[PDB]
């Protein structure tokens, strides 16, 4: 649930917490863990390539299963877990053959729930089956775009996709963006919505909270000198130019999709 914190200090006043009691209070499943060091938004050349990244808390990498290939074995949900690496919540599941995996926790999922992947699998939340097997009009998440690759669409805290149509070898998806997209009908998808839907209701409430999430502060181009940004300079507050990136490209409207290879799959762009 969301929780407005009492204003016992400025910087706590405007805070809203998103508290799920059902998460695991404990150390995660260590076998599925692995190291994940921070970039600072800097590439192999050592240059900053994406500004405003830096610092934040040390995080491990949970090995989430997005490919979801344990066909026919039924699994049961052991617990839900906090993943620092994503807006969603993860679920530690236990297959009957003794293997455990992390999966995106869907909306209704909880400890004790049974889930299943496969063509034969049942059409219920958390189950995963090819979209030619999934009825039209259903909500799914963790959608593969290429068969066998692993889910790439609809992984964020409260996303999902609509299968609006199945026309032969393809099905047409309604993406969260509003973009309509063809996808091969043999690609895989998980039933239901992804879990942590009130994720958006949280409000950080202070500068430090943003820092905790590895976000360095943002300087406005207009606050700079001309040598730095197109917006710089001006005695007092001047802005007599069309908005642009630090690299001179228009920002308020100018489209930038250039991919002519996948134009065919886009049924309708978002609006």
Partner RNA sequence: AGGACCGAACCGACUAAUGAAAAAUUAGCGGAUGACUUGUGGCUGGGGGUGAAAGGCCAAUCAAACCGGGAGAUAGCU
Partner RNA sequence: GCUCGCCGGAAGACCAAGGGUUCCUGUCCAACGUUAAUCGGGGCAGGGUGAGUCGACCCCUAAGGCGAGGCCGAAAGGCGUAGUCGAUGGGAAACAGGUUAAUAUUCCUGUACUUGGUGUUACUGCGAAGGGGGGACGGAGAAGGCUAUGUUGGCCGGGCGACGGUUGUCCCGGUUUAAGCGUGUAGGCUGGUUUUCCAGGCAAAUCCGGAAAAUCAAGGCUGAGGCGUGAUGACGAGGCACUACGGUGCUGAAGCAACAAAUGCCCUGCUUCCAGGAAAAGCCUCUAAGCAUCAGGUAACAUCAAAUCGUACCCCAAACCGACACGGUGGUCAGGUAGAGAAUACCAAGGCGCUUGAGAGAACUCGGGUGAAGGAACUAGGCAAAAUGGUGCCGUAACUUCGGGAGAAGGCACGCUGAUAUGUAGGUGAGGUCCCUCGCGGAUGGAGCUGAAAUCAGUCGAAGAUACCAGCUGGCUGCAACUGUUUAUUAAAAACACAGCACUGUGCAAACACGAAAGUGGACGUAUACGGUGUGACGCCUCCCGGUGCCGGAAGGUUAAUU
Query: Which residues between 5 and 24 bind RNA (CB under 7 A)?
Result: 6-14, 17, 19, 23-24
In sequence order, what DSSP letters do the residues of 225-245 get, joined into one string?
Answer: -TTT-TT---SSS---S--B-
The one among 1, 168, 235, 252 contacting RNA by CB under 7 A: 252
Interface with RNA, residue 268, by CB under 7 A: no
What is the spatial distance between Cα 27 and Cα 79, in angstroms, rounded to a whole number?
12
Q: Which of 166, 109, 108 is nearest to 134 (CA)?
A: 166
3 state SS of 156: coil
Interface with RNA, residue 165, by CB under 7 A: no
Q: How far is the CB of 94 from RNA (least distance, A)?
A: 6
Q: CB under 8 Å to 74, separation ≥6 — which residues?
A: 95, 96, 114, 115, 116
Residue 89 neighbours by CB distance under 10 Å: 22
Footprint of RNA on 166-205 (CB under 7 A): 175-177, 179, 181, 196-200, 203-205
Q: How far is the CB of 121 from RNA (least distance, A)?
A: 12
The one among 109, 115, 121, 157 contacting RNA by CB under 7 A: 157
Residue 134 or 153 with smaller CB distance to RNA: 153
Residue 137 or 259 with smaller CB distance to RNA: 259
Q: How far is the CB of 168 from RNA (least distance, A)?
A: 19
The one among 97, 112, 167, 168 contacting RNA by CB under 7 A: 97
The one among 111, 135, 262, 268 contacting RNA by CB under 7 A: 262
Footprint of RNA on 17-56 (CB under 7 A): 17, 19, 23-28, 30-31, 33-37, 39, 41-54, 56
What is the spatial distance between Cα 168 and Cα 170, in angstroms, rounded to a whole number?
6
Q: How far is the CB of 150 from RNA (least distance, A)?
A: 8
User: Within 13 Å, how many C-alpha atoms sit on residue 30's CB side?
Assistant: 2
Footprint of RNA on 109-148 (CB under 7 A): 145
3 state SS of 207: helix
Interface with RNA, residue 254, by CB under 7 A: yes
Q: Which stretch binds RNA (CB under 7 A): 59-67, 117-125, 126-134, 164-172?
A: 59-67
Q: Which of 131, 132, 123, 135 is nearest to 154 (CA)?
A: 131
Give me the helices (H) in the chain, please: 207-212
User: Is the torsion defined by CA of 152, 35, 102, 209 positive or negative?
Assistant: negative
Q: Which stretch binds RNA (CB under 7 A): 117-125, 128-136, 184-192, 214-222?
A: 214-222
Interface with RNA, residue 219, by CB under 7 A: yes
Q: How many residues bind to RNA according to rule CB under 7 A?
A: 135
Residue 168 or 253 with smaller CB distance to RNA: 253
What is the spatial distance between Cα 155 and Cα 86, in angstroms, rounded to a whole number?
9
């Amino acid at each position: 649930a969301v929780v407005k914190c009492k204003p016992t200090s400025p910087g706590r006043r405007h805070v809203v917490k998103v508290v799920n009691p059902e998460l695991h209070k404990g150390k995660p499943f260590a076998p599925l863990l692995e190291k994940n060091s921070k970039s600072g938004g800097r590439n192999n050349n050592g240059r900053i390539t994406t500004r405003h990244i830096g610092g934040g808390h040390k995080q491990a990498y949970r090995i989430v299963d997005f490919k979801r290939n344990k066909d026919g074995i039924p699994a049961v949900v052991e617990r839900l877990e906090y993943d620092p690496n994503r807006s969603a919540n993860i679920a530690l599941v236990l297959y009957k053959d003794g293997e455990r995996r992390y999966i995106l926790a869907p909306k209704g999922l909880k400890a004790g729930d049974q889930i299943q992947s496969g063509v034969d699998a049942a059409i219920k939340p958390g189950n995963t089956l090819p979209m030619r097997n999934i009825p039209v009009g259903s909500t799914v998440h963790n959608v593969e775009m290429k068969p066998g690759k692993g889910g790439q669409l609809a992984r964020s805290a409260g996303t999902y996709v609509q299968i609006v149509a199945r026309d032969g070898a393809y099905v047409t998806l309604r993406l969260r963006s509003g973009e309509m997209r063809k996808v091969e009908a043999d690609c895989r998808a998980t039933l239901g919505e992804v879990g942590n839907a009130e994720h958006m209701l949280r409000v950080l409430g202070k500068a430090g909270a943003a820092r905790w999430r590895g976000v360095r502060p943002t300087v406005r181009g207009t606050a700079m000198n001309p040598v730095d940004h197109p917006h710089g300079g001006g005695e007092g507050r001047n802005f007599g130019k069309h908005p642009v990136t630090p690299w001179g490209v228009q920002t308020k409207g100018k489209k930038t999709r250039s991919n002519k290879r996948t134009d065919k799959f886009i049924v309708r762009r978002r609006s």
